[PDB]
Symmetry: D2
Subunit: 250 residues, 4 copies
């Protein structure tokens, strides 16, 4: 009697048990989903983190910058879920921006090689993952990616804010492609999660229902709502799981 | 069910084509216990609500009537039982006289009545019902994206722009009770409501299904009803003062 | 001069701190010939650098609106038309803006506020478009209402309605080859509400200058008057139904 | 003139149909003293800049070339004279290979092509501001060209993504430019006929996208004419929008404000 009973869902982005993807995976399993997980570089380490989830799930390697990993992804997922079975959901919870482009480094001092790598991993890969997986997705399916509202500039986030602005645009185009398969594509724009202090503290102040940066469960639940059959007419869009902070000036 | 055990008030049923009728039907299929509110044609509304899968008390509510608003919480408490509170409230009410739906020829008395019913009443209903809502509760109102002007919708577009602003303020008040307030912006639905405006609205409708990456079926209110039920559930707990678009993704595409 | 030879109507002067006073002053410095409307004001308008006829205009008065074009034609001379119109009018009773809880504003007060602050932008365009030249410009004053905030309450709702009205006025004005736009200004200084509200409104103001990349001086209306004159000029000829922000860039920054 | 005595750098001229050519022409008609920058085909660009109403020095600038960016301020100072600074900077540069914009499926654009397009179309707005802010006067203005990317559309594909990135870059450039008392803004223009080549199907789709624009625009939209766009850029370069920064001004006939 779970929200995602019987659904086959791929979840990328687990690195620690504080990863937003770890909480998404935990809630999806509690709700009856059968998962396939993807990890980057430190696969033995990631496998040990995935052992903390309530149910066993196969772990596949996926470096989104690696064309060979993307070319073989659908075949490897099909081995994991069984021939004749397809995915009902895909979760993109991947991001990266070198220290030259996010933090205390001046915005103007980020070399383009660093910005390009960050945009490749954080934005272009949302299209790459949809390209690889839409041929193995069922109608009524759902692709969800993680976002941080980039509509206004802010301290420190710098080039990662630019990568999120690009990701929002990529999501609208992925929705055009996914619609051909009867699949939805949406982003969840979350408030800050402890996975800068003054900026982050502003969310709880503005949020009419408050914001707890130490609690990823409300974000995971929102992703699961989009993976469910309960938002069937929403695509190319952004759902804000931020306590309502973006709707208030002060 | 998605809403098992939840006590939810649903306003705005007039016909079985009303978006509120479909919201009520889906909510009951999902285990919710409803309280319904109707305006003016109560005997007629009772014949329509007899078509729902489960019985529900029907209370009169004219949002322009201060006495109805002053007594609403007490009448709802009588219907659900002393000691019980609401978990959800659905505002599915709108009105704009014909004059407001040429743009310049709408008299202010007509525009004011339309804004009272379509936008101010969202605050009126929250004021009356928040004192009888449980923490984790949810208030949901119906919207039609008014970010851009369009043919014929005219002053009702202005009322929706005011409603979006009212929703952001209601969220500030509702938060004090641990309650969320959000709007669902739906695509056009064939509910009961000249040649020029007729042709323009036909073009607006056709364009909607063309732009929507997953298409849009104006004869099917179920996807909209499901979206309202998602907001009434425990599955969007960090969303408030916001707008969820149940429009096939049409607003995200230019062509 | 930026506005050399242009005939421009300017509403909204009540004191020499009114944003409309600064708009009128800058427009005259830039060579415009003005017609002023107000609703005692002659002593204030005598402080402008040049003489200008002052006509009475209560935007809630249907007779004033019906006779406005004829009265303006008498003032500027038969055979002459207006090139610009400035709406710098706003009103909200203390029940709807200030310290009063959002839920305690009666609709009669909110409706009067929306009539004067939003509907009148359409009323003024209806009255004046028949006497405007092609290439003309209508400009109204706005305060960004995209997010809720303390104290502004129902005046925020009136601005949300005004932004929607501006998009529809642009549709009508386009038929005459006239543009319609709003200038969304930062706060301008045009303990009276208590210690608590005073501190909250002070924080709202300090944050504005903090967020604005070029800063924001609440005591200086000249950057706002210059922005309105840019829209009245021939230099933004392809902008209509839109909003230009003269707020130091504060709305583009989170912190 | 609106820009009398102002020293303004204008990048992006390649043909006399370039939006930058019209921005330069209007700026000179309004009394500005220009410095022009061009990419790769400098001899060809000089023949085009001879068509402007006044002479202006032409400097080479490939925005992907770190050496050109490192020497730019010094070369501009030589052109305008020691002790003089710029009052304006216009970025009117964009590029996206055919794999990322046109008829090619959105999913078939390789990242090397997308990355080159984002480097030239978005990151270079920050590169140019970094190089030129040290030689800009207080009250100065940086303006870049945009095409509203808030909604997806046919064919524009990854160039839409590059514009979404550019809008975000503009908000961060405004934070840096403010330290110098300089504004940074974008002008989002409607479609302009700059330089059946893409086939019947795509041709009809792009034609519908264009016609819809003049239909939506309450004052209409003339796709042949960059002058209303050039005038809008000059308004931002002037002293008449002194409190606008990190922002976007739409010179699109009001099309983006109307659904139909
Ligand atoms: N932490 C927050 O405050 C916050 C708020 C809103 C949105 N988000 C977003 O949520 C997502 C997850 O971030 P997180 O906070 O959980 O941090 P995280 O560090 O736990 O997760 C980021 C993941 O990206 C993966 N990744 C990096 N390079 C990759 C590559 N080449 N191929 C594949 N995967 C790669 C990492 O291995 C890691 O699992 C990101 O998109 C982030 O931007 C985070
Ligand atoms: N039909 C669509 O295309 C569409 C699209 C998006 C949003 N909506 C919105 O959905 C909501 C419901 O509209 P609908 O299309 O189902 O039409 P409807 O006619 O079935 O419902 C409108 C309801 O408003 C009620 N109402 C009017 N005046 C009232 C008053 N004084 N007090 C109380 N109730 C009053 C009517 O009695 C009726 O039940 C409205 O907010 C509407 O704007 C409709
Ligand atoms: N911080 C601010 O002061 C600020 C910021 C942004 C925008 N604005 C807007 O600028 C405009 C002018 O406001 P202001 O700050 O100069 O204040 P103000 O009090 O000087 O101007 C308001 C004007 O509205 C007029 N008005 C009221 N009722 C009227 C009626 N029935 N008929 C005709 N005119 C009527 C008043 O006579 C007055 O001239 C308003 O739209 C306001 O919302 C103000
Ligand atoms: N044409 C339209 O419909 C339209 C609409 C809105 C915005 N815009 C924007 O206006 C700007 C100018 O485009 P246009 O339509 O005038 O086309 P264009 O081809 O005439 O201008 C593009 C310019 O970018 C230059 N450029 C490319 N690579 C470069 C590099 N490595 N270094 C330096 N410069 C480089 C080219 O040499 C050329 O001068 C672009 O930002 C474009 O996106 C165009
Ligand atoms: C070897 N070098 C890395 O491997 C670069 N590194 C490590 C690192 C980056 C920045 C930093 F300073 C410290 C450490 C990354 O690539 C980490 C990723 C993790 C996933 C993504 N993470 C977020 O998007 C995210 N992290 N924190 N926040 C909150 C926030 C809000 C506002 C301002 C600042 C922060 C967000 C929204 C993108 C960055
Ligand atoms: C007697 N006179 C009234 O009693 C006015 N009447 C009845 C009536 C209206 C129009 C009409 F011809 C005939 C009758 C109303 O006040 C009904 C309400 C019902 C609830 C609300 N309904 C919508 O908001 C709604 N109705 N249709 N659409 C689609 C659409 C989209 C864009 C443009 C046009 C249409 C919408 C979005 C607001 C109007
Ligand atoms: C003659 N009796 C009326 O006519 C009532 N009165 C006069 C009055 C009201 C309050 C007060 F104590 C003293 C005087 C009005 O109705 C004033 C109008 C003037 C024009 C409009 N004014 C603004 O829109 C405006 N005023 N202040 N701010 C800054 C701000 C920002 C955020 C929060 C709070 C403040 C704004 C944006 C709308 C209100
Ligand atoms: C003649 N030049 C280009 O072909 C040259 N190449 C390479 C190329 C060659 C052949 C080809 F076959 C496609 C692309 C460019 O990379 C030029 C740049 C110029 C600056 C930028 N240009 C625009 O941004 C721009 N160009 N057209 N439009 C209107 C529009 C709107 C919506 C959909 C489609 C079109 C826009 C908004 C981006 C492209």
């Amino acid at each position: 009697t779970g929200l995602l009973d019987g659904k086959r869902i791929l979840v990328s982005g687990i690195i620690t048990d504080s990863s937003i993807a770890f909480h998404i995976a935990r809630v999806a399993q509690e709700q009856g989903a059968q998962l396939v997980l993807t990890g980057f570089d430190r696969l033995r380490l990631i496998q040990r983190i995935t052992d903390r989830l309530p149910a066993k799930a196969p772990l596949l390697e996926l470096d989104v910058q690696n064309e060979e990993h993307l070319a073989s992804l659908a075949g490897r997922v099909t081995e994991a879920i069984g021939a004749g079975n397809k995915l009902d959901g895909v979760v993109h919870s991947i991001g990266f921006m070198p220290q030259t482009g996010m933090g205390i480094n001046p915005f103007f001092d980020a070399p383009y090689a660093d910005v390009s790598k960050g945009i490749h991993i954080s934005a272009y890969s949302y299209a790459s993952m949809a390209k690889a997986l839409l041929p193995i997705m069922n109608p009524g399916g759902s692709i969800v990616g993680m976002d941080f509202d980039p509509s206004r500039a802010m301290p420190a986030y710098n080039w990662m804010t630019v990568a999120k602005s690009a990701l929002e645009s990529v999501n609208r185009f992925v929705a055009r492609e996914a619609g051909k398969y009867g699949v939805r594509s949406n982003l969840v724009a979350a408030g800050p999660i402890r996975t800068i202090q003054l900026l982050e503290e502003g969310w709880d102040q503005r949020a009419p229902i408050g914001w707890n940066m130490k609690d990823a469960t409300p974000v995971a639940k929102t992703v699961c709502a989009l993976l469910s059959d309960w938002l069937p007419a929403t695509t190319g869009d952004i759902i804000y799981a931020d306590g309502g902070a973006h709707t208030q000036l002060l």
